[PDB]
Design a protein around this ligand. Sequence first.
Ligand SMILES: [Cl-]
Length: 117
Amino acid sequence: AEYSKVPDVEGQDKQKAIDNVSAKSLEPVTIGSGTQIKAQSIKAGNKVLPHSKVLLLTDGDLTMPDMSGWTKEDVIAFENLTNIKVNLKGSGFVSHQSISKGQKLTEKDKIDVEFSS
Ligand SMILES: [Cl-]
């Protein structure tokens, strides 16, 4: 069971952070329309499965990611990172989200996601 070590990318330039996460054989997913990373979903230094997702919250506006194919773990990480409540329905992988990718979000919004096996 090989593990990846999550890098510390908080405060980094967005593209540098994406590159640093990818270099650890992890999948960076950015949230927001900013140019600098404000927060990461996994504590730096932690061992996680290769190719698992690290959510990266930018500065500036929050925007909706493409959650297609996400696990419950991933969607729950999004709720904790953004303080936007997500309602989960079903099991497997995300097959529907109630807000389209790219839309600006506020803590006024709520998301419904459906999972399919
Ligand atoms: Cl691999």
